[PDB]
Scaffold this motif. Structure first.
Motif, PDB file in Angstrom:
ATOM      1  N   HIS A   1       0.816  -1.211   0.000  1.00 18.77           N
ATOM      2  CA  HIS A   1       0.000   0.000   0.000  1.00 18.77           C
ATOM      3  C   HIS A   1       0.853   1.266   0.000  1.00 18.77           C
ATOM      4  O   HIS A   1       2.080   1.228   0.040  1.00 18.77           O
ATOM      5  CB  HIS A   1      -0.956   0.021   1.201  1.00 18.77           C
ATOM      6  N   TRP A   2       0.180   2.401  -0.036  1.00 18.98           N
ATOM      7  CA  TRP A   2       0.872   3.663  -0.196  1.00 18.98           C
ATOM      8  C   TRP A   2       1.494   4.088   1.128  1.00 18.98           C
ATOM      9  O   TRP A   2       1.066   3.670   2.208  1.00 18.98           O
ATOM     10  CB  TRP A   2      -0.109   4.717  -0.701  1.00 18.98           C
ATOM     11  CG  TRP A   2      -1.175   5.101   0.270  1.00 18.98           C
ATOM     12  CD1 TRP A   2      -2.418   4.552   0.384  1.00 18.98           C
ATOM     13  CD2 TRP A   2      -1.100   6.141   1.255  1.00 18.98           C
ATOM     14  NE1 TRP A   2      -3.118   5.178   1.384  1.00 18.98           N
ATOM     15  CE2 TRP A   2      -2.333   6.160   1.932  1.00 18.98           C
ATOM     16  CE3 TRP A   2      -0.113   7.065   1.621  1.00 18.98           C
ATOM     17  CZ2 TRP A   2      -2.605   7.064   2.950  1.00 18.98           C
ATOM     18  CZ3 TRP A   2      -0.386   7.960   2.631  1.00 18.98           C
ATOM     19  CH2 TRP A   2      -1.620   7.959   3.280  1.00 18.98           C
TER      20      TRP A   2
ATOM     21  N   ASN B   1       7.112   3.902  -2.008  1.00 16.84           N
ATOM     22  CA  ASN B   1       5.655   3.971  -2.022  1.00 16.84           C
ATOM     23  C   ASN B   1       5.146   5.368  -1.699  1.00 16.84           C
ATOM     24  O   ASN B   1       3.969   5.523  -1.348  1.00 16.84           O
ATOM     25  CB  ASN B   1       5.039   2.946  -1.065  1.00 16.84           C
ATOM     26  CG  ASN B   1       5.394   3.208   0.396  1.00 16.84           C
ATOM     27  OD1 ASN B   1       6.184   4.093   0.719  1.00 16.84           O
ATOM     28  ND2 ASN B   1       4.801   2.427   1.287  1.00 16.84           N
TER      29      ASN B   1
ATOM     30  N   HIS C   1       5.107   8.038  -6.279  1.00 24.64           N
ATOM     31  CA  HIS C   1       4.543   6.804  -6.791  1.00 24.64           C
ATOM     32  C   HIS C   1       3.025   6.779  -6.788  1.00 24.64           C
ATOM     33  O   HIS C   1       2.437   5.917  -7.449  1.00 24.64           O
ATOM     34  CB  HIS C   1       5.004   5.620  -5.940  1.00 24.64           C
ATOM     35  CG  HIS C   1       6.442   5.269  -6.108  1.00 24.64           C
ATOM     36  ND1 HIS C   1       6.889   4.418  -7.098  1.00 24.64           N
ATOM     37  CD2 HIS C   1       7.535   5.655  -5.414  1.00 24.64           C
ATOM     38  CE1 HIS C   1       8.199   4.292  -7.002  1.00 24.64           C
ATOM     39  NE2 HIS C   1       8.616   5.032  -5.988  1.00 24.64           N
ATOM     40  N   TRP C   2       2.377   7.665  -6.031  1.00 28.26           N
ATOM     41  CA  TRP C   2       0.945   7.532  -5.787  1.00 28.26           C
ATOM     42  C   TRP C   2       0.126   7.567  -7.070  1.00 28.26           C
ATOM     43  O   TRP C   2      -0.912   6.902  -7.149  1.00 28.26           O
ATOM     44  CB  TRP C   2       0.462   8.645  -4.857  1.00 28.26           C
ATOM     45  CG  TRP C   2       1.005   8.565  -3.464  1.00 28.26           C
ATOM     46  CD1 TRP C   2       1.679   7.523  -2.883  1.00 28.26           C
ATOM     47  CD2 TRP C   2       0.911   9.583  -2.473  1.00 28.26           C
ATOM     48  NE1 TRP C   2       2.005   7.837  -1.581  1.00 28.26           N
ATOM     49  CE2 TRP C   2       1.536   9.092  -1.307  1.00 28.26           C
ATOM     50  CE3 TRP C   2       0.355  10.866  -2.449  1.00 28.26           C
ATOM     51  CZ2 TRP C   2       1.622   9.840  -0.138  1.00 28.26           C
ATOM     52  CZ3 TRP C   2       0.429  11.605  -1.285  1.00 28.26           C
ATOM     53  CH2 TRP C   2       1.054  11.086  -0.142  1.00 28.26           C
TER      54      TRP C   2
ATOM     55  N   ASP D   1      -1.560   4.330  -8.746  1.00 31.23           N
ATOM     56  CA  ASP D   1      -2.812   3.777  -8.256  1.00 31.23           C
ATOM     57  C   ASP D   1      -3.898   4.814  -8.061  1.00 31.23           C
ATOM     58  O   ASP D   1      -5.071   4.444  -7.954  1.00 31.23           O
ATOM     59  CB  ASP D   1      -2.563   3.012  -6.957  1.00 31.23           C
ATOM     60  CG  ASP D   1      -1.784   1.749  -7.216  1.00 31.23           C
ATOM     61  OD1 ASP D   1      -2.409   0.766  -7.667  1.00 31.23           O
ATOM     62  OD2 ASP D   1      -0.534   1.750  -7.082  1.00 31.23           O
ATOM     63  N   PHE D   2      -3.532   6.088  -8.044  1.00 30.89           N
ATOM     64  CA  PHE D   2      -4.456   7.199  -7.820  1.00 30.89           C
ATOM     65  C   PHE D   2      -4.142   8.251  -8.874  1.00 30.89           C
ATOM     66  O   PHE D   2      -3.463   9.248  -8.589  1.00 30.89           O
ATOM     67  CB  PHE D   2      -4.307   7.741  -6.392  1.00 30.89           C
ATOM     68  CG  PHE D   2      -4.461   6.687  -5.351  1.00 30.89           C
ATOM     69  CD1 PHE D   2      -5.719   6.289  -4.934  1.00 30.89           C
ATOM     70  CD2 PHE D   2      -3.354   6.036  -4.842  1.00 30.89           C
ATOM     71  CE1 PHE D   2      -5.869   5.275  -3.999  1.00 30.89           C
ATOM     72  CE2 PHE D   2      -3.503   5.013  -3.930  1.00 30.89           C
ATOM     73  CZ  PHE D   2      -4.759   4.630  -3.512  1.00 30.89           C
TER      74      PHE D   2
HETATM   75  N1  LIG Z   1       0.963   3.746  -6.053  1.00 34.16           N
HETATM   76  S1  LIG Z   1       1.208   3.382  -4.508  1.00 34.16           S
HETATM   77  O1  LIG Z   1       2.116   4.353  -3.981  1.00 34.16           O
HETATM   78  O2  LIG Z   1      -0.079   3.189  -3.914  1.00 34.16           O
HETATM   79  C1  LIG Z   1       2.052   1.808  -4.451  1.00 34.16           C
HETATM   80  C2  LIG Z   1       3.303   1.674  -5.038  1.00 34.16           C
HETATM   81  F1  LIG Z   1       3.843   2.683  -5.738  1.00 34.16           F
HETATM   82  C3  LIG Z   1       4.007   0.494  -4.959  1.00 34.16           C
HETATM   83  F2  LIG Z   1       5.213   0.421  -5.565  1.00 34.16           F
HETATM   84  C4  LIG Z   1       3.505  -0.602  -4.312  1.00 34.16           C
HETATM   85  C5  LIG Z   1       2.259  -0.490  -3.758  1.00 34.16           C
HETATM   86  F3  LIG Z   1       1.707  -1.556  -3.141  1.00 34.16           F
HETATM   87  C6  LIG Z   1       1.536   0.681  -3.826  1.00 34.16           C
HETATM   88  F4  LIG Z   1       0.292   0.689  -3.322  1.00 34.16           F
END
Ligand SMILES: NS(=O)(=O)c1c(F)c(F)cc(F)c1F
Ligand SMILES: NS(=O)(=O)c1c(F)c(F)cc(F)c1F
Ligand SMILES: OC[C@H]1O[C@@H](O)[C@H](O)[C@@H](O)[C@@H]1O
Ligand SMILES: OC[C@H]1O[C@H](O)[C@H](O)[C@@H](O)[C@@H]1O
Ligand SMILES: [Zn+2]
Length: 257
Positions: free
Chosen positions: A1-2, A8, A12-13, A16-17
């Motif tokens: 998760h974030w 993370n 990177h958010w 997924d968002f």
């Molecule tokens: N987009 S994020 O920041 O939510 C995220 C990541 F970038 C990640 F590399 C692995 C995750 F499980 C994750 F949820």
């Protein structure tokens, strides 16, 4: 998760968002010279005398102090707001060092921490419906600088040892959030978003100009919390802030001349 780490964190958010790259993301830098006094703003009303705090929770990102929001016990009105917004929780963002930690910046200056009092628009009936609306939330943001102790913060500081790790909670009744405010309610306001995933663009931000002072000892205790759960390797809960995002097609308005 974030989270907030290298792998993370905020950069990177967007994977997924995708709204992370949207048109009204928060926080932003507040350019104090470009911000304009707005005569259409009504007086701001922070009405917390009947607030009912319930519990404090380490959610693995910060700690939330939760309130009873089943009635208009603690509400924000006025200013840029249409109608009544009910307090649901407050939390902070802070740094590993005093020179960083705030989410909003003021002429690029970073404060040691930032307090967010989160409120939802009662016309929408519940927080969950409110976060489907452009005017669903109002967040009152307050900067923290390090200097003299803030007496009204000490009860928060002293319970943190009991919620060190993710998923822990403790009773936190009879806490008065009025003791976290500065003297002045001068503010800047603009339309933005949650600063945490899911980054929803529902927030009217109201950021007070006057910081509160907290002591080094108080903020040092924030930095002893853990992002990790009990029994896992220790990852200190520090630097849980998103950096400033592009202002795009927005204006920041000031309540003061
Ligand atoms: N987009 S994020 O920041 O939510 C995220 C990541 F970038 C990640 F590399 C692995 C995750 F499980 C994750 F949820
Ligand atoms: N930082 S923030 O004030 O935008 C915020 C919210 F408004 C919210 F409703 C839930 C959060 F987890 C959060 F961090
Ligand atoms: O067209 C003039 C208007 O421009 C807007 O961008 C400003 O927010 C107003 O304060 C101003 O009166
Ligand atoms: O007001 C918040 C909390 O402050 C102190 O921790 C009190 O000991 C506790 O009873 C109360 O719930
Ligand atoms: Zn926040």
């Amino acid at each position: 998760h974030w989270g907030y780490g290298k792998h993370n964190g905020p950069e990177h958010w967007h994977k997924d968002f995708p709204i992370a790259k949207g048109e009204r993301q928060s926080p932003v830098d507040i350019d104090t010279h470009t911000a304009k006094y707005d005569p259409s703003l009504k007086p701001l009303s922070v009405s917390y005398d009947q607030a009912t705090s319930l519990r404090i929770l380490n959610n693995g990102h910060a700690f939330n102090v939760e309130f009873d929001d089943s009635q208009d016990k603690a509400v924000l009105k006025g200013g840029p707001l249409d109608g009544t917004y009910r307090l649901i929780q407050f939390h902070f963002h802070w740094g590993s060092l005093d020179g960083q930690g705030s989410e909003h910046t003021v002429d690029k200056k970073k404060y040691a921490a930032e307090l967010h009092l989160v409120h939802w628009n009662t016309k929408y009936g519940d927080f969950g419906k409110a976060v489907q609306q452009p005017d669903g939330l109002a967040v009152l943001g307050i900067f923290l600088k390090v200097g003299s102790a803030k007496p009204g913060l000490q009860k928060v500081v002293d319970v943190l040892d009991s919620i060190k790790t993710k998923g822990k909670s403790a009773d936190f009744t009879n806490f008065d959030p009025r003791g976290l405010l500065p003297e002045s309610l001068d503010y800047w306001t603009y339309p933005g978003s949650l600063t945490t995933p899911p980054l929803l663009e529902c927030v009217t931000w109201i950021v007070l100009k006057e910081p509160i002072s907290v002591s080094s000892e108080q903020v040092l205790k924030f930095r002893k919390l853990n992002f990790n759960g009990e029994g896992e390797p220790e990852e200190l809960m520090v630097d849980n802030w998103r950096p400033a995002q592009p202002l795009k097609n927005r204006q920041i308005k000031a309540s003061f001349k």
